[model samples]
Each structure stands twice: as C-alpha cells, then as structure tokens.
Target chain A: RTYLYRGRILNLALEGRYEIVEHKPAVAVIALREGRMLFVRQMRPAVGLAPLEIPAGLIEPGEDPLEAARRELAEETGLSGDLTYLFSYFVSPGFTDEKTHVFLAENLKEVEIEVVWMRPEEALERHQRGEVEFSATGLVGVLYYHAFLR
Target chain B: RTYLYRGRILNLALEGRYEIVEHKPAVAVIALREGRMLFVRQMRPAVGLAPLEIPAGLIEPGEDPLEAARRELAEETGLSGDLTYLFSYFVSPGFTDEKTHVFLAENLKEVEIEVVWMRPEEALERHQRGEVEFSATGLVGVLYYHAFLR
Candidate 1:
C-alpha cells in the first residue's frame, strides 16, 4: 500500500513514498484594458519578493477553471469582464501537482480595487531586473500576451 | 528555524506549516530545428500520463541556469546548440519555491535523438486533449516559441 511520507527535507528525500506535493489546481487571469495590463505587487513568502503579477487563486474542488479564474480576478482585483480561456498547464511536475489555468479578460469593469498597469516592454524590463517577480502562471500569461495574444 | 512538515494529503493540509514543497530550481530548453520544435513524450508518475515536453531537469547546486539548460537538453535528448536566455519565472509560488529558467536554442545539431515536431496548431490540439501534459515551463516555452520566437 502507498503511504504519505514525512521527515526533514534531507531525510524525506530518502524515505518518501513519492516525492510530490499533491496540490490543488490553480488559476490566473491576464486582464487587459486599453494598452496596459492589470497586475498586483504582493509579497510571496516563498520567494521573499513581491513580484508584479496578475490576479490568481486556487481552484476549489470541482470548480471549473474559467470560474476560478474569474473568481480569483474579482477577489484579488475587484474587477471582472469577458474572460477568454487562454491555456492551462502544470506549474511544477517535479514534486507538485499545481497546474495553472490562465485566462484573458478584456473590456474590464472595475468594481472597487487598485491595479498596476504596464506596457509589455516595461513588464519585460522589470522581469530582467528581478523587479517583476512573477508567479509561475503570471510569467507565462504576461509573456504570452506580449509575444502573441496582445 | 523553519521545518519541512509532512503527512497524509488531507491531514497534511490541515496541520502543515505551509502547503508547499520546497523544490530545486529547474531548467527548460526550447530547441528549434528546421522550423520545428523538438519535444519528448515521457510519463510523469505524479500525473499518471506520458506528456510531451521539452527537455528539462533540475539545476544542480552551484550550476548556472544556462549551463543546466544545456546539460539537461543534452542529457535528455542528446542534442546541443546555440543557447539564448529567454526568461525565468516561478513554477509555483503559492506553496513551492520552485522557479524555472527557460532558454532558446537555435541551429540545433542532433547528436543522437528522437524528437516530436509539432506546429502551433498541432501542439494546441494535443494540449486540448491532454495528449501533451506539458510541465509548466514547457507550456511557456512552447507557447512563447510559437507566438514570438519562431
């Protein structure tokens, strides 16, 4: 029978039944308005850097990816609009099952929130300086927008 | 000092210090050859599927991302070429400290390998059907190549 493993980082590596996090699926939204994109700069304890990123959140069990993307965008930015399913992909398969579903939203209508807007070029520059520390999905979304969708 | 906690999937979430799998940095290579992209189909034990993906691997300690990308590409597919820095982003920031550095390799020379070449449309179709369960970095790299670099 398979069993969950437990131990220190070093020791777990040797005794783990499987080396995976078994995480829930997540969602991210790339909302665009005019020539800028909606983003938030928040601290991620894991990286210790508040990277500029789009709205994102975890998908509750049985939740549709599009629905979760919309919910996350509204929760994080207090904004919403027509969301187009962009793409979905795994975040890290090495030791986690955190897949991310990304969506594109246009014709945004703000309910009550603040967002940072930057051109694609500016975003790329910030990424270069490590100033724009993107969440896994954020980087993909923004780069995709810059390179193709936009 | 922090600790690496562990438990059953459900119980672990309830009492874990933070739901994250501390992971090593990784590298991905977007190799282009003769107007096509090279990919591999491999089984991911965690996901229970053989997903088509670009060559990638963990960045060993003290190894630069570019070097790791090159090494992984060669190790996984037995191919090498002129590598270019494309971008680096987190694979998942919500729980894991895993980031992936992606590179673009051009003028690829096959030392000894077998690679699947797909156009943008074909890749998208496979993605839609779960035929290509790409690692997060693979998705970004392929999409970026299709939308921009190529």
Candidate 2:
C-alpha cells in the first residue's frame, strides 16, 4: 500500500514497499563559452553552504526539457544559447523520483546575473573539494563534459 | 526547526522548508572481464520494474568505499577484482543526502553467482530502455565508461 505525504510542490508517495518521491524532471545546463564553463554559486539550505554548480533547476509541469534548461539558465545565470541534448538520467532511484536532463549549451550570450567561469582543470579542483557540498548533477555534467564531450 | 520523520533505516529531516532524506553513502562497480561489462537484473519496487544495472549497494557503517564496492560486487555478481576509484558524487542533493562512490574493477575472476556480459553498445541499449526504471548512478557509471574510460 502507498501512502501520500504532502508537500508544497513535491509530494512523497510510497509505492509498494519503497517510499518514492514523485517529482518533475529537472534540467541542467553545461554552458560553454570560449574555453570556460559557466557555473552558479548558490547557498543550498539543505547542505547549509554555498556550492558552485552548473546552472540548473526543476522542470515545471508541462514544460519541455530544453525550454526548462533555457529558463533555468536564464534565471540562474542570465545567459541564453542554443542547447544540444547531452544526456538524461535519474538522480536518485532508491527513494526519490527526480530525473535530470542534461544539455550542452553553446554560443551563450551573457546578460545580468553574476556568472563564474572556470577552465576544465580548475573546475575539477573545485569539484574535488566539493565532495559532499557540490551538486551531484553538476559534477556528472562537468566531468562528462571534460572527459568526453569536450 | 528540523522535524525528524522516522523510517526503518532512513529518516527524513525537514530542514528549512525542504524535507531532506538522510541516507548512508553507496558504492557502484563497473566490473569488466575481457571487454564485457558485468550487470544484474533486479526488480526495483520503487519504479515497479526490474532494470539491468551495474552491481551496487549501500555502504555499511564504518565500511570503506572500496570495501563496500568489493562486498556489493561479490554479493551481486560473484566477482572479485582489484578496484580503482573512478569518482564519487551525490546521487541527488536537492532532496536527498545520498552520495554514491563509483569504482572501476580490473582483473576480474568469477566466483559463485551467475553474471551477464555485454559489449558497450549492447549495454547502452539496455540502459536507454531502463531509463525511469534504472538507477541513475548506473546510467552515469555506464555512460561515463562508454564515453571516456573504456
């Protein structure tokens, strides 16, 4: 039997024997301009520290993944660009039902929000220190871009 | 105030405004033998489907990441190998505190349990369909191997 645990936007629903969280799919952007990748530093209440990560956000209901990526990129970094689908995967399957759709954004035009740009190797150092603090999706997207996509 | 929501093993703690699930770290293995990767097909009640995935499990208290990887790999695939740390990342940081440590296993030798072997392209197909049903860590590990490591 499944139980309904309500929340503001995301609610937890127990499915069969596991407590599964039903969530909208999220979008992450690996925005590259010149030789540096764009990242956002935000204070995550859950972790209680600001960590650097690729610009990303949750996909709203009925929103396209690419459009969501564009929205988050603009909201978080104020950048707009052409997006290329890189990959998509679930974030946590043991409990949560959040899936992350990753994209490679090119020809980015910077706007208003503050943006941090770092080269591949420099980003790895920050990621290494991030360990528990960094966003997992950011690590996956950044490393994947460095190792293969780049 | 953080309210603790009780569970059998995992408990949810409401921090700030988000209910974050506190969980132990986990281990995932990319076990290869003669160019074929080892995987397991198991029913994930959370997703209501059994998906093919790399051998993985949670890290027990005080267990080393490499040790946990060895233990899960043995238990799931019945294989013993020399493990190399590939990378570690949080499974989902937005709503969960589960970090997954990934490893690349070499010099593999069969022990007890049955194993399924597949080439890179073949494994990709299984992963593509496994989508919502597959563990996100598995997708990241598999795709990373195909794109860069392998």
Candidate 3:
C-alpha cells in the first residue's frame, strides 16, 4: 500500500497481471439536464439486475473515447450536442480490468425506442402499483449529485 | 462503464470489487509551508531511484480513512494538522488493488522525530529538491491543486 496527499489516495497494490495481455478502451458519457440525471435500466447478467446506467460503450480498436461516447450517447439516448472531458478515471482499480474515460455531455434529445421493461422497470411499475425496491447505482448517482453537484 | 451525475458530482461506477485479501491502506501527505510543499525522496526498490514522493504510509485495517490520513500525516512529515479531502480516486485500477485517497493538509505545527535520513537532515532538504519527479498520487494532487485550489 502507498499513501500520498497527507494520507489520501491510498494505493493498496493487489496481486494481478499488470501486463496487458489484451487491451480494450471503454467510454461513458455523463449527460446531465436541468438537475436530474439520465440513465437506462438494463440488467447485466453478471450484476444480477438491470441497474440504471449512463450511456456508455466500448471503444472499437483505434477508436477514441470521445468519439465512442458521442456515438454511444447518440445511439443509447438518441440525443447529442456537445461533449467535454470531465476527467479520466479507473473504475475498481483493485480488481477490474477496465479503464473508463468519463465525458460530460451537454444538450440532450429524447429518442423513441422500444422500452423492453426489465426487472427494475417491472419493479418500478410495481412501485406505481404498490411499492418496490430499486438498484443501488441509481440512488448512488443521485446521492453523489447531492454531495458534489448541488 | 457508466457516468451518472446528479448535478456535478459524478457517480462513475464501472464499479466492481474483489477482496482486499492482502496489503494495507496507504496515504500521501505533502505539507505546504512558506509557499513550498514538503516532500520526500526515497530510493524506491521497485523503481530503483530515490524518486521524490509525498510522505505517505499504510492505513491499518478498520481505520477510517480520515483517521488514517492524520496518522500518516504526522508519521511521515512529523507535522500535525488538519487536512481536507481534495479528491478520492483509484490508481491503476486495471491491475493493482489499491485505492488512493488524496488530501490537502493545512494549518500546521512542527514536531520532532528521531530518524536518520540518507537524503534529508531537515525539512529544507526535501523542500529544496527542485525538479524531482513524484509518484502518481502526488502528481494527481498537485494537478488538482493547480486546477482547483484557490
């Protein structure tokens, strides 16, 4: 473990293959409008639920994260205008093999797509019907928004 | 990968986790006094150079990061003071299992510690070492200070 910044930024080096046997670049767009954040409920088989996630996708070989974010934002959210580099950060450095370049997208438009309701959606529908529990990331994002944004 | 922002606080969750099976928490502290930042130059065996880095150490298990920050701050720099969270981020999340919590320490007091140094006899030694390269966490903290600090 390594510490810097008066004990902030603790680096606990985990045992793993640092050598990149393979390489893949992914991009996620943080599209914000008026105060509310946008997300889609898609259940990943690995995670066990369709958690709300921002528009994101993997960058094809030789493609840039910015371009990928734009394409993904357009395709997923059906909206596009401007993209800015907020910062580049690693997600789950202790375990995962992924580098996500985060970009903030401005100006959004809603595009109509087939809304295949998943478990979370069904749960939300159930909530409207009665009450239900949702995934963590959706609430986590809003919590951060309250803490860091406004 | 996903970037969800409520307002400005980004909820970047490419979020996955393994176990902290080994190692301890680490911290980095650079004391700012008299318009200069306090740092250290240690002969890192991994890099094979006495590269300059902010004074840092591991946080013990079950210790809050805030407590660890202060503990490491006093240990490495021999100064006791309050520190504010600059930014908390992960370093090299692709392979290394480490989370680097960067902080900015301010409002200081000088204390004495009994330790022999190869490169330092006093604070002046570290303070005057111009053109020395810093580790990843220190680099990021200074960058944040330059970009965000008033």
lDDT of 2 by residue, A1-150 (tens): 465667754566665557766667788898766778787776665556655578888888789999999999888877889998866766766666677888888888877633678775677675566543456666765666666656
Candidate 2 segments exceeding 4 Å error = A111-114, A126-133, B113-116, B125-134
DockQ of each: 0.44, 0.47, 0.04
Clashing pairs in 1: none
The Cα RMSD across the true interface for model 3 is 14.1
For model 1, residues B44-140, the per-residue Cα lDDT tens digits are: 6566665567788888878999999989888888888999987788776655567778898887777863357766557777787866667676677
lDDT of 2: 0.71
The B-chain TM-score of model 2 reads: 0.87
lDDT of 1 by residue, A38-140 (tens): 7776766666666667788878867899999888888888888999887787776555556778888888887862367777567878888766666666677
Q: What is the interface RMSD of each candidate, in Å?
A: 6.0, 2.6, 14.1
Report the lDDT tens digits of candidate 3 across residue range B42-138. Answer: 5443333344456565567788777788887777667788887643433332222344555678888877422222222232234235434335444
TM-score of each: 0.86, 0.87, 0.44
Residue A83 accuracy (lDDT) in model 1: 90
Candidate that beats the other on lDDT, 1 or 2, i.e. the better one: 2
The sequence of per-residue lDDT tens digits that candidate 2 reaches over residues B1-150 is: 375566644666786677777777888898766667776666665555555567888899889999999999889877899998876766666666677888888888878723567765676675556443345665665666666656
